[PDB]
Design a protein around this ligand. Sequence first.
Ligand code: NAD
Ligand code: NAD
Ligand code: NAD
Ligand code: NAD
Ligand code: NRN
Ligand code: NRN
Ligand code: NRN
Ligand code: NRN
Ligand code: NA
Ligand code: NA
Ligand code: NA
Ligand code: NA
Lengths: 430, 429, 429, 430
Amino acid sequence: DKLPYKVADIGLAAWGRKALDIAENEMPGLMRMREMYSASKPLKGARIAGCLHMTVETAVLIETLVALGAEVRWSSCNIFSTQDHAAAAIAKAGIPVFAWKGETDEEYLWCIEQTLHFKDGPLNMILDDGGDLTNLIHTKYPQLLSGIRGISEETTTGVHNLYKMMSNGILKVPAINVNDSVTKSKFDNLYGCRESLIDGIKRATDVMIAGKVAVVAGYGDVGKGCAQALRGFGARVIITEIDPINALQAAMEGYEVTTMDEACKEGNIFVTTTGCVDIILGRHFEQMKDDAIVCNIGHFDVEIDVKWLNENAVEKVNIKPQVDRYWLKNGRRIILLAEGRLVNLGCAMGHPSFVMSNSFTNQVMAQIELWTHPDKYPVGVHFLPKKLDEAVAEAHLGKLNVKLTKLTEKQAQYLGMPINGPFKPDHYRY
Amino acid sequence: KLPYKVADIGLAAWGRKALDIAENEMPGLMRMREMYSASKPLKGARIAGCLHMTVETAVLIETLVALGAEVRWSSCNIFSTQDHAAAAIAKAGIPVFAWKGETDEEYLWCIEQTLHFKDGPLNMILDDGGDLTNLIHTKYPQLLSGIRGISEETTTGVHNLYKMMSNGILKVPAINVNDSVTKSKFDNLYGCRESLIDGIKRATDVMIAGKVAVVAGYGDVGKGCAQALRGFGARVIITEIDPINALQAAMEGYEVTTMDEACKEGNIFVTTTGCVDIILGRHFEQMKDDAIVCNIGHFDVEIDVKWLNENAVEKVNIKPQVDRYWLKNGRRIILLAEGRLVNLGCAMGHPSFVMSNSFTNQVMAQIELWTHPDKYPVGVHFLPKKLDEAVAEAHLGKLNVKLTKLTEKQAQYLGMPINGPFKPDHYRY
Amino acid sequence: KLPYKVADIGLAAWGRKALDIAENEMPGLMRMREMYSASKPLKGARIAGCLHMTVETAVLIETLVALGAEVRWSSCNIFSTQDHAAAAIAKAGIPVFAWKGETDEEYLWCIEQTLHFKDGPLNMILDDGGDLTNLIHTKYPQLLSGIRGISEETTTGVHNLYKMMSNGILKVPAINVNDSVTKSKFDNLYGCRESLIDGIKRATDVMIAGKVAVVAGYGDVGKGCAQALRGFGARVIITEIDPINALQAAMEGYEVTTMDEACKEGNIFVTTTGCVDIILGRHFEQMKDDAIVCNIGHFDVEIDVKWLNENAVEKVNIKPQVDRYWLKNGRRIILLAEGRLVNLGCAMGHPSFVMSNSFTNQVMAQIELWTHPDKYPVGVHFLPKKLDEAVAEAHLGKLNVKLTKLTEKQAQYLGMPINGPFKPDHYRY
Amino acid sequence: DKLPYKVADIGLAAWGRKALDIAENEMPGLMRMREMYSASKPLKGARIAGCLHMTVETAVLIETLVALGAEVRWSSCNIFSTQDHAAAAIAKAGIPVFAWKGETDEEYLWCIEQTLHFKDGPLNMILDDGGDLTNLIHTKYPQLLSGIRGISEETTTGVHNLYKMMSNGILKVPAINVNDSVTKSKFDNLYGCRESLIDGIKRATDVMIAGKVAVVAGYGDVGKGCAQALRGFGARVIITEIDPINALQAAMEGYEVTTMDEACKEGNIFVTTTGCVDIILGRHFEQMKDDAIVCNIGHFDVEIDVKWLNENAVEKVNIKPQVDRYWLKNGRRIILLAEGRLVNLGCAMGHPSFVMSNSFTNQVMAQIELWTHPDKYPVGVHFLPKKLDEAVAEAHLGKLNVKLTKLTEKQAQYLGMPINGPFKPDHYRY
Ligand SMILES: NC(=O)c1ccc[n+]([C@@H]2O[C@H](COP(=O)([O-])OP(=O)(O)OC[C@H]3O[C@@H](n4cnc5c(N)ncnc54)[C@H](O)[C@@H]3O)[C@@H](O)[C@H]2O)c1
Ligand SMILES: NC(=O)c1ccc[n+]([C@@H]2O[C@H](COP(=O)([O-])OP(=O)(O)OC[C@H]3O[C@@H](n4cnc5c(N)ncnc54)[C@H](O)[C@@H]3O)[C@@H](O)[C@H]2O)c1
Ligand SMILES: NC(=O)c1ccc[n+]([C@@H]2O[C@H](COP(=O)([O-])OP(=O)(O)OC[C@H]3O[C@@H](n4cnc5c(N)ncnc54)[C@H](O)[C@@H]3O)[C@@H](O)[C@H]2O)c1
Ligand SMILES: NC(=O)c1ccc[n+]([C@@H]2O[C@H](COP(=O)([O-])OP(=O)(O)OC[C@H]3O[C@@H](n4cnc5c(N)ncnc54)[C@H](O)[C@@H]3O)[C@@H](O)[C@H]2O)c1
Ligand SMILES: Nc1ncnc2c1ncn2[C@@H]1C[C@H](O)[C@@H](O)[C@H]1O
Ligand SMILES: Nc1ncnc2c1ncn2[C@@H]1C[C@H](O)[C@@H](O)[C@H]1O
Ligand SMILES: Nc1ncnc2c1ncn2[C@@H]1C[C@H](O)[C@@H](O)[C@H]1O
Ligand SMILES: Nc1ncnc2c1ncn2[C@@H]1C[C@H](O)[C@@H](O)[C@H]1O
Ligand code: NA
Ligand code: NA
Ligand code: NA
Ligand code: NA
């Protein structure tokens, strides 16, 4: 008496399949995992509950996990990030998915709850982006924890929460931090946002970037990519930071580094990337230039005080889905994107498929590691080995026609490293 | 006769919200309204417009009307109309004949609807690409004596005007708007720098980083497209016939080679030349699997789309304006907008701010031709530099630019008029 | 009379090694030698040159001589001479009067030495900044009728030629070399993009990353300087009087404001305007400690160096062309080259490759004026676009650029001559 | 009967002092160390032998160590990197320094040997860049090892050797890896080379960068900076790499990644950044374009086969010091800079003072840590704590007029971090 899936429109499946066929050819890491492991089925017996943006890319990940032998049930980790044609293709393929663009917060939780129970038992693996599924199980279903072999976690906010859980003695399942694979953090967070931030802003507003002042809160991997994207189209970018190291990086790249208390008077476009609460507040909104565009690209919608806008504006005019224009008591207007939810996925299509192939190849490796070698992973938060990290990058070089050099025997002896790697020490920062 | 013909008048309220937002990004046009709405310099003008029917064009149209013109409009491309913008214009009572996805015969019918007003035939042309200009000269020459002027928006259109003039076949005075400084060095460059990538992304969602992109032509459009692609981490290869443009591209760090070589390397191909026969069957046969091919020049003459349709073994429509072909060699090609201009066909064209430069020039050109026709004999003319400077000045406040004024001592030193113009006529910026 | 006057003839062997290396970077000039050494089109010419006596200029001088001219030379700046290059020229038998660190009176004496040859007075001028042109017009008007032509290298010099012509005081025909496309859009832009930073680094070794740099003017030179500084991670602020140039800088992501505001923020100041009174005492008094201040425009008129000398409480020479001043407010200012052009005064000026563009134009202008004087009435003229294109084409092979040729079908489509020129006269590149 | 110092010309001291006064005002980290520690003299009793490029910046470091109470004797770690006016200023100040530009290899070793013995005993601290002093003591003076409290090591090559020494049981003294402080590797190696590579090439050759093809071997921190510098002036940059992760970074930044076997046919400028032997060989030289400029920026001159040029060229023409033009049997010419030694220091002035203040503030902190808290540092290779790394960056923000944001109590509680840091986990890569 349980729903088999729930999507906006399963009739979108044929279109979704065409988009998936195109994405497969952009995702050689995932396709290589299928080539290597479809016969031996390393994930046989796995029952993976996934909570991760239900996009075309995630659809390719899902079909890879199934090809490797897993049973899978899926929900999205944001109410606006699902791509309904991708969700339809997965549903039509017979995979239980509960995801649509424009869920309410109640429907969102309900969707996660649909992923916990399989035909042959409760979930035994977690694949999470942001930690909502991990937190749901630990807080509300602790009786299921003993039956879960592992968690792999995708994003900075989610891994931050895992480390907090472990330090507070709350974590009861081994986890792999996928965010901090080199081939994830230094690629997805940086080059992904470099493309998908502007895509979200443009699809929402069609605003010209050239000539504008853009304020980017945070200069971590996401903020570095956002800043570079904006500068590239001719915006003057101002950075805010709490970390003196990241601040010094930004200054050395030619950006003005100042506080939001100052920058709010200058910005035409505001992008929050911090993963922290209370970044853009009423006192900032009241000082902004007319028709300032405000958005967030951090995981949770905690950075922008949207409640202040709802409570203090004279009127909110909906322009189109996920674009609202508020008229303030000072007579100026604020354009808010996706109600403060992650803008690249909420207003566009998130990262393009090629860079997601890096992140998702790491996810498949982590699921295989946790499922097939649980003795290597006690309760705690672990990284994938560098040799596997390198292997992810290597799997994407051929698509780009990169010709990698091989060390000679003499060179490898000189450097004291193996010809096949790893090539860097554990502390290397790339 | 029809009051208009659009896709869906029901889109008018959404279109109006988009127009409201665009007005606040178009200070040049709004300034023209502020200055001229009372005096109505375009009273008596009956302007037929043939120009991409977008949100930005809607703001231009309502500016012409505020200035006292009667206007009838069509789009200059079968895929460039934004149906919400067309609906807002139609709802406002302006005769517009335009929708996204016209057949070629519908396209001609739409232009033909703009020719006749209540009081008589058109007496002004506002053209982008020269189709309206050419239609009247070739099919309706009896209307020429009743037309006071033409203003022309784009490089391909002005190229045709100069050709017509040199052949002695141009019969109405024209202003070349494309070659205002504030048009060519802004719209063609910075506009394409944003809107090319928009078109490619909305169509395909492809990652640009890591790709090889081949841009044919390194004029104003090619310069903008190349910079955009490089900015997201594509390796950009340029083709050129002009040794000066070629050397510019080489000095900016781009490999410059022929399409005959570059077709073997590109993952993305963008044609910017305004020239026929740029990407041919012999190129398609050598391309990397799933190469994305598109055109941003005015006419769909650069890519041999006929070759793909005839020679591919499979052709699948992915979604509107995106086709994926399988060739006999087993590889795939993705073709955007059937080779029509990709930024307008697959996205929303240039953003409003830069279009305010171009369209402020257009309003000035219409005012010049309508109110000072004796200044403009039959031939092709530029706006004066003082007006060109005024267009730029009108956009500075929005960006909070603080312009320096010369002192009288400095202006005497330079031998320069203190309010401009500040550059000689040959200045290239 | 002296055969020459240079700092140290002993530097000639080193100078010759530098000339050898530069020849291999200057294919345009070498091509002029290949084409014209046998026919000697400059036979009979007696060319007085006033132009920075650098390695690059030495290659130009030996090209003029290969083409049959007699030449006598001086530098157009007291700090720009490269003494090894001057020595190589002198050792080769060419009368050159130039050394690094001339007094202003020595500078004038050097120009005066270039006026008289064995067979008579000069009959051609090759000028950079207009000092030789102005000297003859004001102090030696009796020599004017014997001078066939002037070719002029730099923006400040051509500005003066146009001023002279409009006042009716120019008496010899002139070619504006600065505004060849292959000069203005390459030398002024890409040359300064490399040589500004060179001058600042050799003088001060300051880190650029993290600094605020203020560039006054956003013409060809300012565009190059700004890009250079931004490339190393300086935050660049632009000042401008021209709303078009100002809007270009804003659209490229630079803050545009006045010097009155920017003087409070800059760590590095670069003047590029060609205008008097850009950085004044009221600016110096507001500058951050150890602000570096320099000028790259032709004349030392942009920075009020007199103010520093009179108002500083301490002044210490760090090394040649680098002075550090302590002001009454307790802060320090570092001034480069006493406000003379910093790239040539503190480094080696533009690299040879881009100077081959400029100097190929110079040789073409000298040939045009000397051999076709009836084409050039008194007034200021440009080289034809075909020659401009030829300059660019001559540098493509060195960079391994592969230029596309139009097919006959494409040239017919475009209405274009198949070998060029490919652009109309108003094209801005 | 030992020399008190040996420099090219002590008469250069007045000029050197002027350059030092200017550098001090660019080095707020070092000046802050003087302000904080000149009174308490934490390095009293220290006898530091330094082997590190004797530049204006190093002179400011030296005077800082002396101000903090140390006795110091110094040599350079490269035969061409000394700046004679800086060496003169140090000599005139009464500090034993043995360094000049253009040492022979025999003089180079002799100079290191002069630094071992002080009035009151042998050295008891090592400050090294490249490991030559560390290696000299371990190999030739093992009887001095017991009297040495610590080593701080500056550069990638030197730290690579320390880790090799420790893994082979050869290291007998605790060492701090300064290279891999965040405020060193991510700033010095990257932004320093971004400026000083082009400076070396230009002072040597005055060549135009725009329009050229430049080949950069290696895409680590140095190669990333070199590549960016060359691209910025309009060179087309081709990268070589053995590490698939770095190769993928380069491709994603828009660079062609291919082998030197292919790239040698295309390059007009070659820059080696690998720290590895056998990068540019005879077979590459014979295929290069006429007047190709070849240089190295890695620590040791092991990357370019200069011996091949000396043995196979028809003639070597010296252009000026550290610039040689070889005429090959194929009729083409090769311009070799600094005989293959590090080009930024050999042909120009190395990194500018501001970024060296980051590296050298870390060096002072490491010397204080090893000298005053030896119990925290057993034999092995250690990093400085993140709080000190952050403090280095923070000390440079004021000079740049950076306004750093402070977390509110509520934000710090939300993030679970202290308001004063550290702000990042140990694995953070910046
Ligand atoms: N939307 C996407 O596709 C996408 C992609 C990757 C990561 N993420 C999310 O983006 C967010 C940032 O990720 P990241 O990897 O860049 O993390 P990060 O830790 O590397 O960067 C965040 C930066 O924010 C700074 N910061 C924290 N509080 C601040 C404040 N109050 N003011 C100014 N700066 C402050 C920190 O000092 C840090 O440098 C996370 O929530 C992550 O989960 C989103
Ligand atoms: N889609 C848009 O929003 C948009 C905007 C502005 C202009 N345009 C159109 O874009 C096109 C280009 O305009 P532009 O202003 O850049 O013109 P342009 O004349 O400045 O540049 C075109 C370049 O193409 C080069 N070229 C010509 N034939 C070639 C060939 N066979 N191979 C390689 N290069 C060749 C020319 O040498 C020239 O430099 C025109 O059709 C124009 O109307 C479109
Ligand atoms: N050092 C060199 O190697 C070198 C090379 C080329 C040109 N030059 C010289 O550089 C100078 C600039 O040449 P250009 O080709 O860039 O000329 P330009 O006319 O293109 O640019 C100068 C700019 O300065 C702006 N300007 C004028 N007065 C100003 C003021 N008071 N404040 C702010 N901006 C002001 C103008 O609007 C103009 O855009 C000239 O003196 C020229 O001869 C030097
Ligand atoms: N001259 C300077 O001022 C300066 C500054 C900092 C570091 N260094 C020196 O520069 C060198 C590089 O330092 P780094 O910090 O960039 O080290 P790194 O380890 O970060 O980078 C070196 C790169 O070289 C690559 N590599 C190794 N062998 C190769 C080969 N055969 N072909 C192509 N690539 C290869 C590696 O994969 C690595 O990514 C070291 O010797 C270091 O001591 C010099
Ligand atoms: N297209 C996408 N599909 C699925 N997930 C996506 C996508 N774009 C960004 N992300 C996520 C957002 C997360 O914060 C980050 O880990 C990144 O991988
Ligand atoms: N948004 C737009 N509206 C209306 N016209 C647009 C738009 N974007 C580009 N163009 C045109 C295409 C033309 O070729 C060019 O002149 C440019 O102004
Ligand atoms: N190296 C140089 N030799 C000779 N002249 C040079 C050099 N660099 C810049 N210039 C001049 C300075 C002039 O203003 C500009 O025309 C430029 O060509
Ligand atoms: N100016 C300099 N002084 C002293 N040392 C310098 C300098 N430039 C680079 N280095 C070194 C070269 C080393 O490889 C690197 O650690 C860097 O810090
Ligand atoms: Na996608
Ligand atoms: Na728009
Ligand atoms: Na030179
Ligand atoms: Na220095």
